[PDB]
Structure 1
Amino acid sequence: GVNEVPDYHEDIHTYLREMEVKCKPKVGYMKKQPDITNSMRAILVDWLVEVGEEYKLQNETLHLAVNYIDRFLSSMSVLRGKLQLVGTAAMLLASKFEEIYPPEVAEFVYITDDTYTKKQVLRMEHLVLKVLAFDLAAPTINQFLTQYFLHQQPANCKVESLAMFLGELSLIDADPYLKYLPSVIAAAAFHLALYTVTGQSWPESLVQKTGYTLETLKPCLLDLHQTYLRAPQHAQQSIREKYKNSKYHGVSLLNPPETLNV
């Protein structure tokens, strides 16, 4: 029904496809950052996963913040001492956009363990807004996933949660995931989740909607399948912890498949 906007879902999907291209970060910004690395970014994202957990924020909020951060770091060079300030303002701006009840600024100051001042957080909020030119309605993995979910026959919560999980894992690791558009990571995540749980594959009907096939998704899928296999070993564990919770059906506890036959 209307909750799925039958009259507008195609218009909206096409528009998200256009915007994801405009909102895309520079794929190789880290090698142009003198003082920060993929590893440091991973630590930041993992931490933002914990903040969203602690403040019971929407997963959408988390995705928007990472989008803001990656875009910011594409044109602004940042000292390792200040990375967390960028992340904090990003989370704030994402929360004010996407949350019914955003945490107050002071709570954001609190989670940085008084590394920064309220004044510093609000000034980075302004800088981020300047740098992004207030373009904050960015497409996320989640906005695509939720549409892809409408193609399940029938709906399966394990599938939906697992896909969300795999999408989240991709936020952590700029190499390789900066090179994939949200819509593609989402496609990979959905197919992997579906395969893992039910044995089925990326459906015909999503080939109609998206123009993507197992062929076109294959690169991303091979990466996401590795990330899934290695996830217990990753330095960063906050997403696995989160997805043990019953809220997400404990999906981090499912066993990845050993092969995709793709």
Structure 2
Amino acid sequence: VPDYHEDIHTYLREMEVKCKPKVGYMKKQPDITNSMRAILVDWLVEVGEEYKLQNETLHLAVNYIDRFLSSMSVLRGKLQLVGTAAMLLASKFEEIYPPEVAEFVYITDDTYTKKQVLRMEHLVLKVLTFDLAAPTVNQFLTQYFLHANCKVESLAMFLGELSLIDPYLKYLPSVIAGAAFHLALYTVTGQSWPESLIRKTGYTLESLKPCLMDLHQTYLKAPQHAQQSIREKYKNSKYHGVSLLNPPETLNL
């Protein structure tokens, strides 16, 4: 029933901007690199797929990671601890039967003790000001899918996760959601972005052209990346094994 769908859409469109993290934050930090953000998120998605979690858990966890690093200096040895704390917070918020603190202090090979994780939790709740209900791309994808073949959505979510692997932090989550949805639609069946979505979100193809080509080139370069944890995860028939498809060479915009 559409008694609230458009209202929630407008609300999320308003909220996605207030919590938007800074872009150039990574250079300010002394000892961390974008390569290192990629390594953290790689290990993080590995651990998440281990404990049989949900993808929105990962979305919110990496969002907390981003909004945190953009505001606090840290030494590299603490990045895993912070990532574990963020995943724990995401599980507590969204997931039904949250994996306990013991599992997360174990998976780190006990490089950290429980009390350190608890104090990091105190700190991260302090800095985040207890505002964890941030919007993510996945909600936009799911809302868009209402206007539907399982493979299309699997590919779209795949592209969204690929985007969060690494110029996308300049675009809004709605922007990246639209780009991934349209490119996946073209890849799977060649159809184009229908009018009703443009009426709904106001976004046109022309506005999303830059992120569209960024997503296309990253899609091309993805199969040869140094890390394929998302790829091997999406090699399973649960996601229909769709990670092995060919990246289209050039769009027909």
TM category, shorter: over 0.9
Match of 1:17 among 13, 19, 22: 13
TM-superposed deviation, 1:200: 0.7
Distance 2:129 2:60 in 1: 15
Q: CA deviation at 1:150?
A: 0.7
- 1:80-105 residue CA offsets vs partner (Å, 9 max, x unmatched): 11111111100000000010011100
Does the CA-based 8 Å contact 1:66-1:90 persist in structure 2? yes
Query: Root-mean-square deviation (CA), in Å?
Result: 1.0
- Kindly report structure 1 stretches of 4+ aligned residues shifted beyond 6 Å: none
Q: CA deviation at 1:236?
A: 2.1
- Cα distance in 1 for residues equivalent to 2:122 and 2:210: 38
Q: How many residue pairs end up in the alignment?
A: 253
Secondary structure of 1:120's counterpart equals: helix
Q: CA deviation at 1:55?
A: 0.6
Partner Cα separation in structure 1 for residue 171 and residue 229 of structure 2: 23
Tell me the CA shift for residue 187 of structure 1.
0.5
Contact 1:33 / 1:77 at 8 angstroms: preserved in 2?
yes
Q: Quick one: distance in 1 between partners of 2:32 and 2:80?
A: 11
Q: 2 CA distance for matches of 1:30 and 1:244?
A: 32
2:178 aligns with one of 172, 177, 187: 187
Question: For each residue in 1:134-165, what CA deviation from the matched residue of structure 2 results, as whole angstroms up to 9, or x when unmatched?
Answer: 111010110100001111xxx11111000000
1:55 aligned to 34, 51, 59, which one? 51
SS at match of 2:170: coil
Task: After superposition, give the CA deviation of every residue in 1:209-256 in whole Å (9 maximum; x if it has no partner).
Answer: 111111001111111111111111112211111111111111112212
Return the offset for 1:47: 1.0
Deviations 1:56-85 (A, max 9, x none): 100000000000000001110111111111
Map of 1:208 onto structure 2: 199
CA distance, structure 2, for counterparts of residue 55 and residue 165 of structure 1: 19
Instruction: Return the offset for 1:201.
Output: 1.2
- 1:217-232 aligned within 5 A: 217-232=208-223
8 Å Cα contact 1:42-1:236 kept in structure 2: no
**5+ unaligned residues in a row in structure 1: which ranges?**
none
> What fraction of aligned residue pairs are identical, expressed as a percent?
96
Hey, what's the Cα distance between the residues in 2 that align with 1:236 and 1:25? 25
Name the structure 2 match of 1:239: 230
| TM-score normalized with structure 1 length | 0.94
Comparing 222-231 and 62-71, the one that deviates more? 222-231
Indicate the SS of the match to 2:111. coil
Aligned to 1:79: 75
Question: TM-score with structure 2 length normalisation?
Answer: 0.98
1: CA distance, partners of 2:33 / 2:168: 14
